[model samples]
Target chain A: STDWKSDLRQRGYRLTPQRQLVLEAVDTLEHATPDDILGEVRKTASGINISTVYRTLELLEELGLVSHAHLGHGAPTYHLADRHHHIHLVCRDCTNVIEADLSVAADFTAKLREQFGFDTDMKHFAIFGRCES
Target chain B: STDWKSDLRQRGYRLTPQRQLVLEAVDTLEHATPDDILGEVRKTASGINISTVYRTLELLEELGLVSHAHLGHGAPTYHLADRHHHIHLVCRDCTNVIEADLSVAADFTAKLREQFGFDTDMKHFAIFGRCES
Candidate 1:
């Protein structure tokens, strides 16, 4: 029912045809690599390209619509925004995983986007390096 | 040097010569792809296989000993970056942990760094919370 077309609007991002196709491919696969998404996207539009996939993915991730993380080997894996929640944190000093909630960083995320063109969901593939001490 | 050896040893993984080679390769290269790392590692041990190199890099990455960034075009590049001052939030209600990056909240930390003498250190552990429930 709901797709990124509406989701992006709320996130302050524009969802073009290209972005729509990319998001559809991502959700269909659930877990995919860049190449995987590229292939899936082509199933819909034969003209779509890899660079476009990457570009769209960056946008999707930035808008908090999609998430990508390092899984096994090869390119990092991509997961839909609805697939999971919570953030990942690895203590550089101990490698002990400390989990937390997303609510605490609402302002922080806004600050990062405004100050720096950065997108990070500490809960996903991106693990923040910190410590207990 | 001797520090990481003991640090890892106490944690379980012994810093073997292979791990050392991989670590040194990353440190010297600053930021490099896995293939780039394999090339550097092979300079000394021509017999080191790609799979071995891959495994080593993965371990380092998981430990937060090395930072992983999706630089350039595809995949991820590794490097040494600040593994300092991060918060890990554990949900009290659901027990779901969310790892937080303090960098995302630069203003909050930097504001403190200027106001109080306390820099971005200590209290690195995330505050326990109900999260964005």
Candidate 2:
């Protein structure tokens, strides 16, 4: 959206054609990997290199526009960072990724803080699913 | 005590000498990898093959007596699944694994259902620790 555009512009990154294409690809794919984004970018910007895609992803991650997940290692999957504070539901069979907002986990974090003086960062709690065929 | 022995017996798995040794090896070691277990097991069963150790670990995992963790792939660590519905805290420097019971997560699950009609199974909510070395 315009918010994303403004955020990038505020960070001193002009919305170039390549950046716009990469952003568009990320916006379309919900839980996409770098390879997935590259595939999408190639459809529009055929000359863009894979290294460029990687760098762009890193840049976006640093800008807090994108985030990543690790599902037992193939490629680190990415998602829009501004969406919600959510956890991932990774399908073991097809490797499909789904997100669920875990605002409720905030309560658990509160309790941990109260009981054990433990401060929890609930951003990385993920579970894998046994997907049906 | 007898329940575990009987469970193994009913599964057509005899409490063989080697099997008993392996079982004890798993019982004593918590959140141990096959390598961690092998270190304990080799103390008693000195001549045990690493391949045999690997096979024993696989058998234990299949028996639901042991579970493994993948921390971005160095080695799959083992733990007793029967302990509790808990998550792990893996320290980055020393690679220490700490356990935490997430009974409080039940409240969050309830809230998710109430708010978004989402069903959450939160047994695998693990987070990593950045240990100061």
Candidate 3:
């Protein structure tokens, strides 16, 4: 398949701008819940109903162009494809991707608000970006 | 309020041999898939329908008694409850689960701190941490 645009095109997929718009939103966020992606899309796009966003997402998921996972809480988060949303801790030395947890960082993520109005998600093919020397 | 055991009993539920058998299997094999749990249950149980296993499990999950999670692929796995559990470093050789002592996990915590300047919890559930060859 070519660009998702062309991929869907060949399949005679309507490729609504609304779906395209939501795709861009998920592409930018990498991993976002429907509500989270909708919120981001609304920053620039208007009149896009949440149902449209839901339908678009479900279509993409059904078309196998995207996938989703339940990370921690309500609403499974979405990503471009079925790949690592959890940290893949690559050991720079032995390359043995040792174990790590996602929640402890949530502790720090917890402090990111009110203290800084900050939010972060550690899912979606994040290379665990840390060495296990 | 969700009073757990009382909550389920409050739902006018009763304990049955089949349910108890399945529960015993799940409790013993914390991360077992339904089939795995079923296999375990059938070891000492007869006339047990796989459908009943699914129904009992669904009821437990709905009633908020037993909990299940997805590891990666295949059917989602089931565990006991919200209570804390340790990680399992499955022996690739024997296929036996070596529940890594939380104390040893402290060393992992230290390494994460020193290597990545990162802090993440390593507990909560079991996984094949590594091949304990």
Candidate 4:
């Protein structure tokens, strides 16, 4: 919590109120979009606008404090970068999101690395599929 | 090409001119959005609007003539259902798309099936990653 301020300064990013509020909202909500963060941030600072939320999210992502994933057809969902990483398996039929451990993609990521020199960002996009539930 | 008409009839779907035009555009473009298909379809039928393109694409997908993939941030890209299937690996850094054989995901898919009862639609969404130049 407090460390983020120093970390931001260390990384050459100024810590403004909007930036801090946006990052706090991301951590609190776990998985949210800019609109979602805006809703949460507005509870404390009603003057905060959506454009500020978008810019702050962009800044936080540049600072490597958060990452965004395309979880659905709409806006991308943002998550804290320092949190535990997992693959999102979204059910096309049921619309349920399943979290799978990163270890499950180890072999596949390794293969892509060897064959194509590609580094897979497993959580950056949900794997679309159907679940038997 | 010609078989699709008979197949659609067998499946209780009448192949209308707009439907046929939309499906043909999907085949010709390989991977295109409804708007992209609209532009191509208008070459022959200038009166066709974006709304018609969207409805026809939805109807065609329902009839299993085409499938849509969330290949990028904007719109879903449609592909012929009968075409050769491949996984889309999209590079986040450079935004280049790489096609990988379905076999590349064989083991991973099998693991998801056994562990989580998830049937992965590998091509329904592009796998995001970073690619070496």
Q: Which candidate achieves the best TM-score against the true structure?
A: 4
Q: lDDT for each of the candidates?
A: 0.61, 0.65, 0.59, 0.82
i-RMS for every candidate: 11.1, 5.4, 14.9, 1.7
Q: Please tell me the TM-score of chain B in candidate 2 relative to the true structure's chain B.
A: 0.71
Q: Which parts of model 1 are misplaced by more than 4 Å?
A: A1-133, B81-105, B108-133
Instruction: Score candidate 4 by TM-score against the native.
Output: 0.88
Candidate 3 per-residue lDDT over residues B10-73, each given as its tens digit: 7888658778778778778867788888898898787787888999999877766777644432
Share of native C-alpha contacts between chains A and B (below 8 angstroms) recovered by candidate 2: 0.23
lDDT agreement of model 4 with the native = 0.82
* Pairs of colliding residues, candidate 1: A87-A123, A88-A123, A99-B89, A99-B97, A99-B98, A100-B89, A100-B97, A100-B98, B88-B126
DockQ of 4: 0.64
Q: Put down candidate 1 lDDT per residue, A8-101, tens digits, no spaces.
A: 5776768777788888887888657889988888887889889989888997787777877543222366777677466434444553444446
Angstrom error at residue B7, model 4: 2.5
Q: Tens-digit lDDT track for model 2 on B32-58?
A: 666776778778788777788788778
Ordered list by lDDT, greatest first:
4, 2, 1, 3
Between the candidate structures 1 and 3, which one is better when assessed by DockQ?
A: 1
How high is the lDDT of residue A130 in model 4? 78
Docking class of 2: incorrect
Go through the candidates in order and give each one's DockQ.
0.08, 0.19, 0.02, 0.64
